[PDB]
Amino acid sequence: SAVSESQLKKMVSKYKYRDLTVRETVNVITLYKDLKPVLDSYGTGSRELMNLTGTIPVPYRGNTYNIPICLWLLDTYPYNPPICFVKPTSSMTIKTGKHVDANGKIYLPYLHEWKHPQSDLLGLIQVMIVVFGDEPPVFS
Structure with a gap:
């Protein structure tokens, strides 16, 4: 744990739901x-x-690949x-497809119908692992 909870709380000082985002x-x-x-x-x-x-980490064709992502948490998260x-x-190059557009933006049913408290980041990442395993969003 390189970043402490204290440091995280400071990062989201302007957020509406601070502890929920930190947790x-x-x-x-x-x-x-x-x-x-x-x-x-x-x-x-x-x-x-x-x-x-x-x-x-995403398994694909027998090997585990490290897919680069960036998850922006709005000040209204969760x-x-x-x-x-x-x-x-x-x-690497972005692989435009069903769940990824030209800019690399990810599209998932999980994101489209997002609803707290049923939806959370751990759940979202689990879905990403499954989806990207079926179709890597990047290629060499």
Whole structure:
């Protein structure tokens, strides 16, 4: 745990549901060791938001790949869904398809009908693992 709960609470100081966002973030970073919490601007330098960036392990063709993603938590998380992206490296390219558009934006039924408390980040990532395992959102 590189980032403490105290540090996370500070990151979401302007959020509407702070502890709920911190709790779910801790759960995610604990289970997914390659996802890191980062305070960054989404689109506008002033639109500071916490996002979980890194990779998630996805089994494919006998091997486990580390798919690069970025999950933006809006200041209304968990009542509104995160905005999710596939972030290909310099050697990777986004694979446009059913659940990923040209910009790498992820589309999932889980996101479209998102409803707290049934929906959460751990559940979302589990779905991503299954979907990406069937069709990797990136290629070399």
